[PDB]
């Protein structure tokens, strides 16, 4: 029984409360497709999980013939390596390496730092980084003076302990930017996104697969339109790992037979 870990990140993973009798509400899409829901335990109630990644997990489950239990990441983070001396990963990366999870099914960004300790599938989503703001405030992009040389007058940050945080730490050139960001980062994208609507946050550097969808739904928000950096999401497995080849082979098959497009049509478009 595979222990799947994941994280609240719409439109890839929705997390909604359980009905009184321990079950999930049955729902169909507007195009008449059943919205598959799985029980996911998380911070420790059972809850209802569905979305882009859940559909993908179900296909991977049935294609490779395995059962699973899904739980939400304990600390709520994607995962960066931090010092203790010794080092340890937090977030979903920590739970995968520690055995709390056998496989990560989430919008987990593939990068060099994580790829040295875990195995990544071929990407199930091709993607990038962009900036989300409120309608009214307009920014050139990644090179607007309001972010290059920052200030307290214009605030901008990303999600704490995420791939974006890793991206802005490793670069000697983004030092001035990351200085402003580390004192303003958020524990989750939803909190940051909500902060932009509340005007307490002025810009949000985050995953375009999330930000653009958040703009197509919440019309009180828009993004830059640019993609200043491109990255992909992958399935995370331990270094062993008997599932690495077939999970990856199944991601490639799902792209080629239109499955990934139908997922994109259901959740991201």
């Amino acid at each position: 029984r595979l222990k799947i870990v994941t994280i609240h990140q719409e439109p890839f993973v929705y997390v909604k409360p359980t009905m009184s009798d321990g079950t999930c509400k049955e729902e169909f899409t507007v195009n008449g497709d059943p919205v598959k829901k799985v029980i996911c335990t998380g911070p420790t109630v059972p809850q209802c999980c569905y979305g882009f990644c859940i559909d993908l997990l179900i296909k991977l489950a049935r294609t490779m013939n395995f059962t699973y239990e899904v739980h939400l990441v304990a600390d709520g983070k994607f995962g960066t390596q931090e010092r203790v001396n010794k080092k340890e990963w937090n977030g979903m990366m920590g739970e995968l390496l520690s055995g709390q999870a056998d496989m990560i099914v989430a919008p987990l960004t593939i990068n060099n730092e994580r790829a040295q300790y875990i195995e990544f599938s071929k990407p199930f989503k091709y993607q990038g980084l962009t900036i989300l703001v409120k309608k009214g405030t307009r920014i050139t992009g990644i090179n607007d003076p309001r972010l290059r040389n920052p200030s307290d007058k214009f605030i901008y940050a990303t999600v704490k302990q995420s791939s974006v945080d890793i991206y802005f730490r490793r670069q000697v050139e983004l030092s001035t930017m990351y200085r402003h960001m580390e004192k303003h980062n958020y524990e989750s994208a939803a909190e940051a996104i909500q902060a932009v609507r509340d005007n307490k946050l002025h810009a949000f550097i985050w995953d375009s697969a999330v930000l653009e969808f958040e703009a197509s739904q919440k019309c009180d928000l828009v993004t830059t339109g640019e993609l200043f950096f491109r990255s992909g999401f992958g399935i995370g497995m331990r270094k062993d790992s008997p599932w690495k080849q077939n999970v990856s082979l199944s991601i490639l098959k799902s792209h080629e037979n239109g499955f990934m497009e139908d997922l994109d049509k259901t959740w991201v478009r």
């Binding site: 060099n112 071929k122 037979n257 478009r269």
Partner: protein, 278 residues
């Protein structure tokens, strides 16, 4: 030891082939040999020396410096990227599966069939099945209704691809009637399809996304455009093919991921792939 046989395949701007200086390989190029046939009635031939440059070649140079290896580059003589013919591979993939090359460097698309017989590195450029039109034509992507049921529109859209590749094979398995209708508009090659769009005989050309983005970016007057990258079908990428269980895959992956993370990848893409248009 760590001296590697590497196969490649000409496809500008990813691999560009030049003759030798008359008069050693020149500047931006690396030596790449090509076994040239004497005629078509014999297997007899001669190793011709040539010079290879381009996007993927720069990748090869960066990998050689980082992963620390030496190599003999050569161009594939039989086939293109790789196609299983009667369960027998040819092209760049063939050189790997049958162990004449330890890795393949080029515009080699990662798919499921090839990943069964070879190992692929992480993708170093995004590609897929995309659509190119003239400015002013409104189409979503491959799965647009004006492509799946062309005769639902009057007049029907005129669109095709270059046959016998991964594009035609993908469309035939996924949309049988689309493939049936679009046979009539099969193009001889990429350049012929461009001219067909420019002169109005074609309404759309379905092909490799990375190739179409490069052509649309270089097009004179910028009249040809591709759909948004969000509507690319069967998204995937060009990757390095290695032998199954190759010991080089891990270090190639981390080096490739390093180039993406430290900007060395974006630099190569403006030195080779970015054009006048947008």
């Amino acid at each position: 030891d760590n001296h590697l046989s590497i196969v490649t395949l000409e496809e500008a701007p990813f691999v560009i082939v030049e003759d030798i200086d008359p008069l050693t390989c020149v500047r931006n190029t690396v030596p790449c040999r090509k076994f040239v046939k004497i005629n078509n009635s014999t297997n007899e031939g001669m190793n011709v020396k040539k010079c290879c440059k381009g996007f993927c070649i720069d990748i090869l140079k960066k990998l050689s410096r980082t992963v620390k290896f030496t190599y003999d580059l050569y161009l594939v003589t039989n086939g293109k990227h790789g196609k299983k013919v009667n369960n027998v591979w040819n092209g760049m993939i063939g050189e790997v599966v049958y162990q004449r090359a330890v890795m393949a460097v080029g515009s080699l698309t990662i798919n499921e069939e090839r990943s069964e017989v070879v190992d692929f590195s992480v993708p170093f450029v995004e590609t897929g099945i995309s659509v190119m039109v003239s400015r002013g034509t409104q189409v979503t992507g491959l799965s647009d209704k004006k492509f799946q049921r062309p005769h639902d529109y009057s007049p029907p859209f005129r669109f095709g691809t270059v046959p016998n590749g991964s594009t035609e094979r993908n469309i035939r398995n996924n949309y049988p009637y689309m493939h049936q209708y679009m046979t009539r508009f099969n193009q001889r090659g990429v350049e012929d399809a461009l001219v067909s769009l420019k002169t109005g005989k074609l309404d759309a050309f379905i092909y490799d996304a990375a190739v179409l983005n490069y052509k649309a970016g270089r097009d004179e007057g910028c009249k040809l455009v591709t759909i948004g990258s969000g509507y690319i079908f069967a998204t995937t990428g060009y990757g390095i093919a290695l032998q199954k269980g190759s010991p080089w895959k891990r270090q190639i992956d981390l080096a490739l991921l390093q180039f993406v993370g430290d900007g060395e990848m974006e630099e190569l893409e403006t030195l080779w792939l970015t054009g006048i248009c947008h």
